[PDB]
Structures are given as C-alpha cells and as structure tokens.
Nucleic acid binder design. Structure first.
Ligand SMILES: Nc1ncnc2c1ncn2[C@@H]1O[C@H](C[C@@H](N)CC[C@H](N)C(=O)O)[C@@H](O)[C@H]1O
Ligand SMILES: Nc1ncnc2c1ncn2[C@@H]1O[C@H](C[C@@H](N)CC[C@H](N)C(=O)O)[C@@H](O)[C@H]1O
Lengths: 239, 249
RNA sequence: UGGGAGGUCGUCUAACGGUAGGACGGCGGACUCUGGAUCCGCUGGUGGAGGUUCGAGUCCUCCCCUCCCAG
C-alpha cells in the first residue's frame, strides 16, 4: 500500500479526501494512510507565529523556515527510510499522467503545502527534493494541490479499482433511459456483440482526442487498428 | 461591495468545507464576498436505497452516474441561479485550465459547477445541460470535487478584497505572465544560508529591479516558452539580457 | 584618470544662516480572525578638514566621493 505525510497549516482540509469516496474507503481499509503535521505545533510563542513579512518590504506574508523545517524533520523521522519530500508549487514540474505513474512508485512521500505569498527560498534549497505544479494557474494555498496529487496517485494503490489509459481521452458514455430529451443511445451499444462495441468506443476515443486535444496525439505509437479507426473517423469530419 | 455566487452539484458537498471554512477563501465566504451553495443528487434520488449510479450501455469498467438525480439537481441549481448562470462540467476532456482561462472564468458573476463521479456522466446531459467543459490538468482524479474547488480557488484570487492587498494578486506566478521571484523572510541567517544583501539594503529601487530581474531569470530557466511572444519593456529586456549573460558565466 | 552637475538616516524626501523631521526599511515587543495581517516602540543622517558668523546642512576655500558629456 501507500503512506503519505502532509505538512500543512490546515490539516483538517485533508478530511476532504480521508473521509469520502474512493480515497475515504482506501483509508478505512488501511490501504492508504495519511498523516498530517502542522507547523503551528512547532512554534514556541504565544501567538504561534509561522510567518512574517518578506524582506525588502512590499505587501504579503512568507512562511517562516523553522516551523516548517521542524515539522518536516518530524515527519521524515516518523516516516522511516527514504521518504521523498515534495513541495507543491506553480514553479514546479507540471503534473501529468506520466508524472503520476512515476510518483506512484515511491512507497512514502511527504507533501509540503504553501500559503500566502509562499515559503522561504532557503527551505526549498535545504529540505525539498522535488517541486510539482498541478497546472499553469495560481492558488491561495497548497492543500488542494496536495490532495489532487494524493488522489491521482491513489488510483494506483493495488486493490482500489480510466481516461488516458492508452494516452487517449475517454469515449462518451450512456446509461438509462434509452431516450433522454430526444437523444437516443447509439444503436451499436445495443448490439450486444462486445467486439463491435469495443471498436466503436476506441474509434470514438481517437476521434475525441484528435479533435479536442490533437497535441496529445503527437507522441503516441498507434497500433495498425488505431491508425485505421482514426483515419475512418477523419473521413466523416471533413465530409 | 463585490460578490460572487457559485452553485455546486456534488455527491459529497461536505468536501467543500475545505474551502469555505479555511484560509482566504473561507474568509471570503464569511465576508459574503463569495457564496457557495451545494445541491446533492442523493437528495433527488427517488430510489428507496438512494442509488445515485447506474449501468453504462455496453458493459465494462465502472458505473455511471444515474441520470435522474443528477439531471434534477442541475435543474434545481439552474432554477435558483436564474439568468447569467453559466454551467461548467469538470472533466479531463475539457479545456485545459491556465491563468488566461482563469481570468476569463472570473468574468462570470454566477457559475454552476458539476462534479462527476464513477466513470462520469451521460453524454446527453452534457449536450443538453452543460455550457462548457473544463479540465484542471492532463491527469485523472476520482471525482470533480477537487477540480471544482481548484477552479473556485484560482478564480477567488481575482475577486477584490479576497486577498486584502490587491498588489498580492500580481506578486504571484502567471499574474503578469512570468514566474514569481524567490522570497525570503526572518531570520537573516539560518543554517548557513544568508538572505541576499539587496533585500536588506532598504534601497527600494535596487530591490524592485532585483525582484524583477529574478522573476525574468526564473521564467527563462524553467519556463522559457512563457517568454515567447511576451511584451516586455526596455528595462525588462535589459534585465533579462543581463540575466542570460550572468547565468552562463 | 578632460568639461559640466551634485553630496542629508540604508533608500526617498523636507528644514530662513537658529536645535536636522517624514515616509519606507531594519530590529524589538504585543496581537483569543493565520489575518497575502494589525497595533505599539526602538534604531538611524548632513562626506572631511579649514574660514566667515554670536551661530553653518545651508555662504567661502581646499580635500574626498558620486552622476552626466569621447577615454
Ligand atoms: N499551480 C500550483 N501548483 C501547486 N501548488 C500551488 C500552485 N499554485 C499555488 N500553489 C500552492 O499555493 C501556495 C501559496 C501561493 N499563493 C504561493 C505562490 C508563490 N508566490 C509562487 O508564485 O510560487 C504555494 O506556496 C503553493 O504551495
Ligand atoms: N483532470 C480533470 N479535470 C476535471 N475534472 C476531472 C479531472 N479528472 C477527473 N475529473 C472529475 O472526476 C469525474 C469522474 C472521473 N473519476 C472519471 C471521468 C471520466 N474519465 C470522464 O470521461 O469524464 C470526471 O467526470 C470529472 O468530473
């Protein structure tokens, strides 16, 4: 299974994944364990200070190095041999399914969540192994990015289960009723012949990947069949 | 004052406490700057056992969300929102979110966010009820709730009064299309790493230029593509050239 | 190191020839809303010697240092 350490000022936010859905069930079955450490518990003053103003002035607050460092060492300690420390940040490697598959190898990870204007550069230099971004946009804190990462990798823990399965966008899906607001379910889905249906769905994934996200298409090495189905799909669009 | 309304359809509305009860966004909610209402398809399920999923035609992996509870929750939300309510489906097949897209979404006063579960939702509900599809990235999650919260948070940073200092909004990556410069705070020396002297000089102009040059250097080194097609200034051009030079030596 | 211009807390900016203030910064404390915070204090300057004057940040001389205009 998998163990995840989180350093965050709002550990209760993590209940969002540790108590609901697939991940909640994973936690209940001891397949996934998530432990949180809060830098505030590492302060030594009445107001539990974990941040201050960035030098050179100007607006904003930066998190202080010491509570985070102490929290990280505590986590690393109670983590064992070889825990990799990742900092969530928009300046890090942009996360994608390949990165997710790579991340799913580590048995233990510690995730550092920023707030306000960020964290001290020296903490990044001295304690962080890798930086990961969930996308080219900026959030108010690292807790959501951390939960996103945790969820994406959790879809791999053995015994818990599929877009990008083959590098392609998923195909369209249908359920009851047979007719919805005048829209009928594709007759092919009703033939009951599993093979004709599979080929239809695959053609659909190719068509969808090609239209909405053609760049995803550039790197793949398609089977003869996939190339054929995509060309067939291509013929209908320009007609 | 300013204000935004977000309607959410999700089987696990309690997850949203993560943003409505914590940090800047939680405060935004407390100050009535941001309002979030959550409708749960389970409250719409007729089924005695309150079944919210259903089988996909054609078999295979997964279950799909059952059409009636979900459709009905959406109709209720659209009904509460009135006009100007744009409906977005969070899905990996949607438009990949970036800071430009965030600025675009932030132009809406009302949004309804549909969070999928299981293998997703019936395609016909997407065609008939969804206005736009959005992805937070090229990776797959167990549900649309995290994506939804992400979208809300990213856009929330643009509502006036959410951050309290409006200049903070710009002092982040992608704000002006460049990555942020590195930051330092107290104490001045910690475990042998010293704070760069310019930041302690009290010399405002040198500090402004240092911060700007650093932002440029970092962008060039990590994400040079952002630089492509950017419209600098003479000063920025000068600082960048200096940075490209200095980095090599 | 040739011809102009100019030197005030670290930076920015004030002061009649009458005792040098302010903003930002930095440091120190509080702060039962961790707040992209707030509040209260402390720190700190006329580049250097001469002369004029009852008195010089200010006027005069020299020296030193800095910016602009071909080294
Ligand atoms: N795109 C993102 N991917 C991962 N984490 C993010 C992302 N955007 C923000 N965060 C987290 O949110 C925290 C607070 C941010 N406002 C700080 C941003 C920081 N000034 C920067 O530009 O890198 C960051 O420290 C990260 O922990
Ligand atoms: N990258 C993403 N961007 C936006 N929403 C996502 C993303 N990944 C998962 N989701 C949400 O999670 C839901 C259920 C997913 N487990 C499976 C989705 C399914 N692959 C599809 O074709 O939509 C998706 O329908 C979305 O609501």
């Amino acid at each position: 299974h998998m163990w995840i350490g989180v350093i965050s000022l709002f550990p209760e936010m993590f209940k969002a994944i540790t108590e609901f859905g697939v991940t909640g069930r994973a936690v209940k079955h001891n397949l996934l364990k998530v432990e949180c450490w809060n830098p505030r518990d590492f302060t030594f003053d009445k107001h539990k200070t974990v941040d201050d103003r960035p030098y050179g002035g100007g607006p904003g607050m930066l998190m202080m190095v010491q509570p985070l460092r102490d929290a990280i060492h505590t986590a690393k300690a109670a983590a064992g041999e070889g825990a990799k420390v990742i900092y969530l940040s928009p300046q890090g490697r942009k996360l994608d399914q390949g990165g997710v598959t790579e991340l799913a190898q580590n048995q233990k990870l510690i995730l550092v969540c920023g707030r306000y204007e960020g964290i001290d550069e020296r903490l990044i230099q001295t304690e962080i192994d890798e930086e990961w971004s969930i996308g080219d946009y900026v959030l108010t804190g690292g807790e959501l990015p951390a939960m996103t990462l945790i969820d994406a990798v959790a879809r791999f823990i053995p015994g818990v289960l599929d877009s990008f399965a083959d590098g392609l966008l998923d195909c369209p899906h249908y359920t009851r009723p047979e007719v919805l607001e005048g829209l009928t379910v594709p007759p092919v889905l009703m033939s009951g012949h599993h093979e004709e249906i599979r080929k239809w769905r695959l053609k659909q994934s190719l068509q969808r990947t090609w239209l909405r996200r053609p760049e995803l298409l550039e790197g793949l090495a398609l089977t003869d069949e996939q190339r054929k189905l995509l060309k067939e799909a291509q013929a209908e669009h320009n007609s």
